[PDB]
C-alpha cells in the first residue's frame, strides 16, 4: 500500500518545495527570477512584464550564476566565474550591461577575482573590493577610483571581513556600507598581522603531485585577535585630483582600553551613522552615533548620544548586540534588548536620552524588527499561543502601545504558524512567507488595510505528489524539568501506533541560543528515517536554547558542555519511558555543535544511548575561534575560565565510549572546525582502547556539501543507524 | 578442550619467543646483554664473567636505552633521551664512561641532539654528527675536531643520510665509514636544496592549540633528487692546527653525465676503498676502487680497476648493487651478481681484471656472502631441497669450487630450514640462528671442524607453554602457472579437516623481490586468525617475487600493478577450488605495497574476493619516492613510462569497488606513504558513489606502531574480518 519517502528521494530531490523569491525595487514593484527570464511585477494588481529576456545573454560565453540590477534599473551586474571561499565569501568575475543601450560595457571593466561588489542604494554607483583594496565607480564605464592602498592578502582587509569577522560577527564577506543616498561609503579595515594561522593539507585533484598547505589567519580561543578601524569616504569628492581622503571614526575610549570588536553599523540618515562596539569580554557594548560636520569635514560622535548595553547574566545580544532601527529624522530608534525580566523586547530610544521605554513586554520574545513607518512598527515574535517555536508578524501602533495587531496569526492557523516577511521600500506592501507546519504558502499584502491581495505560491504541485506517499507526522510539545517547560519535537512514522515500540534517534544541535523544536515543515534525512525506517526522530531544546528568555539561554554562560548536554540526556531518559519508545534502541546524532554535544552525551556514561554519530564535532574549546568561544566561555587563562575549558573536552571522556557504538566523521579541509578536533578525539579513543567507526571526507569542509560527499555521508550514516537498530 | 591463541594473546604478548643476541668483540669472545647486566662469554668453553654490573648506573638519573662498548673495552657509550625520527634515524644524548677508572667522563661531552655516533673499528676514536656536521674525538675526554662546516638542517647533510637515502639505499641514518684500522673516516654529503618538501599536519598532544606542519625534503617520482659528494679525511692529521682537509673522491665520468646515486661503500684495505654508483635510470652501475696516494695526499681510482654491472632485463641488484667482499690483500673480491641464466650467484673478481668467474651455479640463489677467510667463503642460499623459501649456511673451498659443504642443512632438518648466521671477528666461531619451521633454536659452532659447541637457546620455555594451546599448522607448497612453479603457504587452523570448508584470508605484500612463502615460524595476527577464528591465512609469491631468479623477479619491470596483482588473483582462484576453501568467504589484506596490491585486486572486478583491508597503501606511483618507484617504473614522462604510471592507479578502478566491502586505514603522520595516497582513494570512491569503511590514525606513521595504535588497528581489523566472514 503506497510508497514511503526514501533515502534516494532525499538525496535525489524527487519532492521539491517551491519558493517565491522576489526582490522589491520600489514601493510598488518587485522582480521575479523565472530561470530563463527576469520579470517585474506590479504589487497592486499582479500584472507583470518581461524585464530581461532569457536569450539576452546567449553569446556571452560564460555561465552566469547571479545578477544584480542597479537601483536605477539602468544597468545590470553579471556574476560569473564564481569560486567559493568560506561560508559567505567568494571571488567572481563581473560584466556590466547597459540597459539604456542594450550594450555590454567593455571599458574600465571590473577586475577578475573581485572579492565583493555592490551598487549604492540609489542611482548606479559601484564599490568593489579587489586585492583587498576598495574601489569606487561613479559610472559603469568610467575609470574607477582607488580608495585604499593598504590591502595585502591575509594581512590587511579593506572593505571585506577576515575569517572570524565573516563567520562570527557580520555573517557576510562585505565590510562596506553605503549611506542611504549613496554620498558616503563607510568601511571597516581589519589588521590580522599577528593573528596565528591555522594550516592543513588540501589534496586537490589526483593530478596534484604534492598536497598543498592552506593557511588562514584564524584566532583560536585566547589567541591574538585581528584589530579593526572604521572609515567614511565621500564619493562625491573623488573627482580625479588625488587619493581620496578617508575619515576615520575611532574609539570609544571605553573600548580602546583593551581588545574589542566592531559589531554593527547602521546608517541613520544621510549624515548620521551609528556603530556598535563590543569588548573582547562580550558582556559590555557601546553604541556611538556620529554626525557629519560639514565645516570640519570629519565625523563627530557626541558622548551625549552614546548608549551602553551590557549584561550581568551573560553576553550581550542573542549572538551580538541587536541592530537599531531609526525613525525618519534619525533622532530616535527602536532596538531589541533584554528585559529586566530577561526577555528580549523592543525598546524606544531618543538618541540623546539614556533611558529607553519598552513598548512590548511578556514572557515571549520579539525575534526581530521587520519594518518601521511613522505610524507603525512591524515585528516578528513567538508570542502567539505562548509557543516559542512559532513565528508571527505583528504591528504595534507607535502613538499607543496598547494597539498591537497580529497580522499572520489567523490567516490559516492550521497550516501556518511560522512566518517571515519581506516589505516593499516604504512598507506599502509585504510578502508573508509561511514555512510550516503545513506546506509553504507565500502571500502578498498591502499595508494600508493589511488585506491579502493574492496567493503567490501555495505549493499545490508538491501537495499532489505527497498524498501518494506515506509521509511522517510532527508533534511539537513539552515536558517539564524543575518547574520550567522545555519544548521538543518528534517526526513520527506514518500510522504511528502508540501501542507499538519504536527506535528513537535524538537529532541534536543545542548550541547557545538555538532552537530545534519548531513548527517548520521539512523534507530531510529525518523524513526518510521516519517514513521508510519507522524511526522516531526527536529534538529537544534544553538549557542554553534561545527565544525563551535569558534564564534559559544564559544558563550555560561560562559552562559550555554542561547543562545543554545533561538536558539532552534527561529528555531521552523521559522519552524512553513514554511507552512507544524502545529503551534498548535509542541513538543520538549531531553536526558541528551538535557533534560536540552528541560526543559529550555518548561519553557521559549515562547508558541511555546504544550508539551515536558526531559530524565535524568541536572536541575542546581552545581549538575553536575566539569570537564565538569566548562569548560563552571567557578567556582560557587560569585567572578566568581555563579550568572549565579543560573540564569540558570530549577527550577526557574517552573511557566511557567503551559502552557505546560511535561514528566520527569530519571533512579534512574544514576551515571552521579543524579536522584537528576529531583527530584528537580518535587519538584519545585509541589510547584507552575503545573501538569506533570513522570516516574522513577528503577536501570537504564544515558543510560536507559537495554533491557526491553529501550523498555519501548520508548513505554511510543510514547504514550505521539501521545496523545499530535492526 | 584446551584454549586457542587469541587476539589478546597477540596484542598482550603472552607467548614470547626467546632470543640470543650476542655481539662479538674479538675472535674468541662475545657480549650478552642480560637485562640487568652485560656479560662477556668465552666461545671455546662457554664460561662467562660480569663485564658491567646492572647497578653500575643507578644514580645516572637517566634511563639508558642502549650502549656501545668501544672496540678497546676501555670505554662504554651511553645512549639516552632517544627520540625517534624515520625508520632508522633518531637523535639522542650521550655520556661516555671510562672503564679504566670507573668514572663518568664529564668534559668535552658529546652534544645533546646528536644525530649519529660510532666508535672507529679499532681502539677508541669517535665520530659523531651534530647539527648536520661531522665531529671527531681522538680521546673520549678531549676536545672534538669539527670536520665539516656546511651542515644546515634539511639542506646539507654531512655524515648522515637525507630521507630517501635512509629509506631506500643505505637502510641507515649513518653516512660515514671508518677505514679498518681507524686512520681514515670516509663520508657522504647530501645536498637537498632543490628537493621538494612533503608537508602534512602533526597534531601532537591535546594541549597544542595550533597543529604543526611537518616538512621533509622528499623527492617523489620524477622530481628533483638530492645530489651527493664523497669525502675521505685522515683522522691522524687533525692535531689542532686548522680545519681538517677532506679529500673528495668524485665521478665516475659515466655517472657525472646525469643524475646518479652513491649506492655502496666498502673499505678493502687500510688504503683502498671501493664505491658503487648508480645512474638515476637504475639498470647501470659502476664500481670504483680508489687507493690512497701517500705522496699526493689524494685518492685515485684507476680506471683499470673500474667494474661495470648492468642489467638488460631490469634494474641492478635485488634492491641496489650487492656489496663486494675483498680478500686479505684487497686485490680480489667476491660479489653476488646475476647469472647469464638470471640467477644471483657469487663471482670472483681480480680488482684489475674485467671478467669474473662464477663459483656457484644452479637454479637457486645465494642470499648473501656471510664470511670470507683465506680458505673458505661462507654463504647463505636457498639451494637445499630446491625450496626458495629455505635458508642454509654453506661453505665453499676457495681452492676447489667443487668442495661445497652445507653446514646447517642436516643439523635438525625437521625443525630447522631457515638459518641466518653471525661469525666472530676472524670467523673462528659462528652462531647459527634457526627461525623455522619449528621454534627458534640458537647454536654456537667453531669453524675449524664445524662442530657444534652447544645450544645457546632452544626456547624450551615457550615450547612448554605452546603445548597447552591449540596452535595452527603451516603448509609450504606450490602450484603451477604457465609451466613455472610458484610457492605459497597457508596457516591452517588446528585439527584441520580437508573435509570441512574454511573461509580464507589472503595475506599479501608482493612487492619487487619479496617473499611471503617461507619456512619461518611466526606468532602474529594470522596465528590468531587461524587458531581462534578458524580462518585459513594464505600467502602467495607470484611474478615479481624474489630469490627465484630474474625471469620471475623482472617480470614486472616497468609494469608495477600488473602481474603481481593478477597472480594474487589467480592463486586465490586456485585455492577456492581446493575443496577445503569456502568460495563465498575469501578475503584479502595487505599493508604498504601489500595495501596497494590489495586495493588493485579489490578493484580488478575479478569478483573472487568478498572483502579486503588495505593499510597505508600506495595509490599512484607518482606519489611515492623517486629512488624506489623509478627503480621499477622508470621516469613518469611521456618519452619514458608515464602511460603506465597513469594506468596503474587505484583511483582509476574506483567503480569496481561497488562489488566489495573495503576497509582503508592510514596514519596521518605517515612520512613514507603520505596520507595523501589514501586521501585520493577515498575521494575517488566518494565520486563514483561506493560505500566503504575507513579509519585514520592520528599522528601515527607508516608502521602504526605505538602500543595503543597497534592494538587498536588489529582489534578493528579483527572485527571487520569476522563480520565479513559471518562468524564472530
Ligand atoms: N560560530 C557559529 C556562528 C553561528 O552560530 N551562526 C552565525 C552567526 C549568527 C548566529 C547563527 N549561526 C548561523 O549562521 C548558523 C551557523 C551554524 C549552524 C546553524 C546556523 C558557527 C558554528 C558554531 C559552532 F559551535 C560550531 F562548532 C560550528 C559552527 F559553524
Ligand atoms: N622503499 C621500500 C624500501 C625497502 O623495500 N626496504 C629498504 C631498503 C632495502 C630493501 C628491503 N626493504 C627493507 O628495508 C624492508 C622494508 C619494508 C618491508 C620489508 C623489508 C619501502 C616501502 C616500499 C613501498 F612500496 C611502500 F609503500 C612502503 C615501504 F615502506
XYZ file of N, CA and C in Angstrom, chain A residues 196-201 203-211 213 215 218-221 223 620 622-623 649 651 664 675-676 678-680 682-683 686-687 690-699 708-709 712 716 719, chain B residues 196-201 203-211 213 215 218-221 223 620 622-623 649 651 664 675-676 678-680 682-683 686-687 690-699 708-709 712 716 719:
312
model
N 47.443 34.204 14.567
C 48.113 32.978 14.128
C 47.356 32.365 12.955
N 48.004 31.412 12.299
C 47.448 30.755 11.143
C 47.075 29.317 11.402
N 45.901 28.916 10.945
C 45.560 27.503 11.050
C 46.106 26.956 9.696
N 46.739 25.771 9.720
C 47.318 25.137 8.498
C 46.844 23.703 8.374
N 46.458 23.348 7.152
C 46.012 21.994 6.892
C 46.277 21.650 5.414
N 46.449 20.357 5.138
C 46.672 19.866 3.777
C 45.378 19.872 2.910
N 44.379 18.208 -0.698
C 44.933 17.334 -1.714
C 44.669 17.661 -3.169
N 43.502 18.249 -3.447
C 43.131 18.626 -4.800
C 42.927 17.445 -5.742
N 42.812 17.717 -7.022
C 42.594 16.637 -7.946
C 43.797 15.676 -7.926
N 43.530 14.444 -8.255
C 44.503 13.409 -8.334
C 45.807 13.897 -8.976
N 45.694 14.662 -10.050
C 46.898 15.150 -10.714
C 47.878 15.967 -9.857
N 47.477 16.518 -8.708
C 48.404 17.319 -7.895
C 49.402 16.356 -7.267
N 50.695 16.521 -7.546
C 51.713 15.607 -7.015
C 52.025 15.769 -5.517
N 52.128 17.019 -5.108
C 52.390 17.387 -3.733
C 51.141 18.115 -3.232
N 50.612 17.684 -2.080
C 49.439 18.243 -1.419
C 49.803 19.687 -1.086
N 49.352 23.215 1.204
C 49.093 23.537 2.604
C 48.308 24.867 2.622
N 46.686 28.026 4.541
C 46.876 28.713 5.795
C 45.978 29.937 5.889
N 43.474 32.644 11.654
C 42.292 32.193 12.411
C 42.672 32.233 13.891
N 42.049 33.119 14.677
C 42.405 33.187 16.094
C 41.605 32.194 16.905
N 42.272 31.242 17.551
C 41.571 30.276 18.398
C 41.362 30.924 19.769
N 40.630 30.235 20.648
C 40.340 30.758 21.984
C 41.562 31.347 22.718
N 43.768 33.506 21.759
C 44.906 33.938 20.935
C 44.819 35.420 20.516
N 37.329 20.343 21.981
C 37.841 21.106 23.088
C 37.841 22.565 22.650
N 39.436 25.193 23.304
C 40.605 26.007 22.923
C 40.915 25.857 21.427
N 40.298 24.874 20.776
C 40.524 24.705 19.354
C 39.600 25.591 18.526
N 36.216 18.901 27.648
C 36.668 18.268 26.396
C 36.050 16.885 26.205
N 37.744 14.503 24.808
C 38.857 13.582 25.077
C 38.846 13.023 26.470
N 32.412 8.734 13.987
C 33.053 10.051 13.951
C 33.352 10.347 12.486
N 39.945 19.726 11.272
C 39.977 18.252 11.350
C 40.682 17.907 12.683
N 41.575 18.808 13.074
C 42.300 18.667 14.314
C 41.426 18.146 15.455
N 38.522 16.357 15.522
C 38.253 14.926 15.512
C 39.576 14.133 15.582
N 40.682 14.698 15.088
C 41.946 13.950 15.177
C 42.290 13.715 16.649
N 41.979 14.672 17.503
C 42.300 14.491 18.902
C 41.298 13.534 19.591
N 39.837 10.805 18.085
C 40.259 9.459 17.709
C 41.531 9.061 18.452
N 42.483 9.990 18.589
C 43.719 9.646 19.279
C 43.469 9.319 20.731
N 41.841 5.832 20.843
C 42.808 4.800 20.588
C 43.618 4.525 21.857
N 43.986 5.601 22.539
C 44.777 5.498 23.767
C 44.174 4.726 24.947
N 39.247 1.915 22.866
C 37.824 1.739 22.585
C 37.662 1.696 21.065
N 36.897 0.733 20.578
C 36.740 0.626 19.133
C 35.617 1.578 18.678
N 35.723 2.109 17.466
C 34.728 3.008 16.935
C 34.899 3.008 15.446
N 33.987 3.681 14.752
C 33.959 3.764 13.293
C 34.352 5.163 12.903
N 34.920 5.300 11.724
C 35.270 6.635 11.323
C 35.156 6.781 9.835
N 35.110 8.036 9.438
C 35.081 8.352 8.029
C 35.592 9.772 7.870
N 36.596 9.948 7.022
C 37.080 11.301 6.764
C 36.559 11.615 5.355
N 36.354 12.894 5.055
C 35.927 13.292 3.723
C 37.004 14.210 3.190
N 37.761 13.671 2.246
C 38.859 14.393 1.620
C 38.449 15.706 0.975
N 39.124 16.767 1.373
C 38.867 18.100 0.821
C 37.470 18.707 1.093
N 28.507 14.807 -4.333
C 28.872 13.435 -4.023
C 29.156 13.188 -2.557
N 29.802 14.151 -1.883
C 30.122 13.952 -0.452
C 28.867 13.938 0.384
N 27.138 10.627 -0.089
C 27.916 9.579 0.531
C 27.837 9.551 2.070
N 26.184 6.575 4.251
C 27.017 5.927 5.269
C 26.373 5.946 6.631
N 23.338 3.493 6.842
C 23.730 2.096 7.110
C 24.011 1.903 8.597
N 61.864 18.880 -3.508
C 60.638 19.454 -2.946
C 60.388 18.895 -1.536
N 59.458 19.536 -0.824
C 59.086 19.133 0.533
C 57.697 18.510 0.614
N 57.579 17.447 1.360
C 56.242 16.907 1.549
C 55.833 17.633 2.859
N 54.587 18.080 2.928
C 54.071 18.769 4.109
C 52.781 18.102 4.566
N 52.681 17.897 5.885
C 51.482 17.327 6.473
C 51.345 17.808 7.915
N 50.109 17.815 8.430
C 49.787 18.262 9.793
C 50.140 17.247 10.890
N 49.329 16.791 14.836
C 48.501 17.372 15.886
C 49.088 17.438 17.290
N 49.925 16.459 17.605
C 50.571 16.404 18.915
C 49.585 16.203 20.096
N 50.076 16.379 21.314
C 49.188 16.236 22.445
C 48.105 17.278 22.373
N 46.993 16.922 22.997
C 45.789 17.737 23.091
C 46.126 19.223 23.358
N 47.069 19.471 24.262
C 47.458 20.832 24.595
C 47.987 21.711 23.478
N 48.356 21.151 22.323
C 48.827 22.013 21.237
C 47.586 22.710 20.661
N 47.599 24.035 20.644
C 46.448 24.779 20.153
C 46.323 24.754 18.652
N 47.460 24.989 17.990
C 47.555 25.031 16.545
C 48.398 23.852 16.115
N 47.864 23.002 15.221
C 48.548 21.820 14.696
C 49.826 22.313 14.030
N 52.905 21.932 11.159
C 53.080 21.443 9.780
C 54.510 20.869 9.667
N 57.566 19.400 7.520
C 58.016 19.430 6.138
C 59.351 18.688 5.991
N 61.552 15.443 0.307
C 61.192 14.097 -0.128
C 60.914 14.183 -1.634
N 61.768 13.547 -2.451
C 61.558 13.608 -3.894
C 60.594 12.524 -4.360
N 59.459 12.933 -4.899
C 58.516 11.949 -5.421
C 58.995 11.517 -6.845
N 58.310 10.551 -7.442
C 58.707 10.067 -8.770
C 58.919 11.189 -9.802
N 60.821 13.778 -9.657
C 61.140 15.120 -9.137
C 62.625 15.371 -9.030
N 49.010 5.721 -6.269
C 49.514 6.090 -7.578
C 50.995 6.352 -7.392
N 53.233 8.136 -8.813
C 53.856 9.447 -8.832
C 53.904 10.023 -7.413
N 53.151 9.430 -6.484
C 53.155 9.932 -5.105
C 54.261 9.303 -4.299
N 46.983 3.278 -11.281
C 46.480 3.874 -10.030
C 45.277 3.108 -9.450
N 42.891 4.693 -7.899
C 41.751 5.568 -8.233
C 40.981 5.229 -9.508
N 39.825 0.878 4.471
C 41.016 1.668 4.151
C 41.540 2.281 5.471
N 49.673 10.287 3.752
C 48.212 10.109 3.932
C 47.560 10.451 2.589
N 48.203 11.374 1.880
C 47.741 11.815 0.585
C 47.226 10.672 -0.259
N 45.967 7.605 0.472
C 44.617 7.127 0.820
C 43.591 8.287 0.683
N 44.049 9.527 0.829
C 43.078 10.616 0.683
C 42.533 10.658 -0.748
N 43.370 10.280 -1.698
C 42.935 10.287 -3.089
C 42.072 9.050 -3.396
N 39.973 7.512 -1.148
C 38.646 7.815 -0.618
C 37.892 8.824 -1.485
N 38.584 9.860 -1.969
C 37.903 10.877 -2.783
C 37.402 10.284 -4.090
N 34.296 8.152 -3.201
C 33.161 9.024 -2.963
C 32.567 9.536 -4.279
N 33.425 9.917 -5.226
C 32.967 10.440 -6.520
C 32.143 9.483 -7.400
N 30.659 4.723 -4.034
C 30.792 3.378 -3.473
C 31.047 3.549 -1.982
N 30.299 2.800 -1.172
C 30.416 2.858 0.274
C 31.600 1.997 0.693
N 32.287 2.412 1.764
C 33.428 1.706 2.287
C 33.645 2.140 3.712
N 34.581 1.481 4.378
C 34.906 1.765 5.780
C 36.245 2.449 5.829
N 36.432 3.283 6.824
C 37.714 3.931 6.945
C 38.145 4.113 8.421
N 39.439 4.300 8.570
C 39.986 4.565 9.864
C 41.280 5.325 9.679
N 41.401 6.500 10.279
C 42.668 7.245 10.177
C 43.319 7.078 11.566
N 44.645 7.111 11.629
C 45.313 7.011 12.941
C 46.097 8.258 13.125
N 45.573 9.118 13.997
C 46.158 10.418 14.296
C 47.594 10.351 14.747
N 48.476 11.052 14.033
C 49.883 11.126 14.356
C 50.688 9.839 14.239
N 49.343 1.643 21.742
C 47.888 1.761 21.649
C 47.357 1.666 20.225
N 48.058 2.291 19.270
C 47.608 2.281 17.878
C 47.698 0.876 17.309
N 44.829 -1.149 18.631
C 43.565 -0.671 18.100
C 43.314 -1.062 16.629
N 40.353 -3.512 15.364
C 39.394 -3.012 14.382
C 39.303 -3.940 13.163
N 37.463 -7.212 13.964
C 36.022 -7.066 13.892
C 35.532 -7.112 12.436
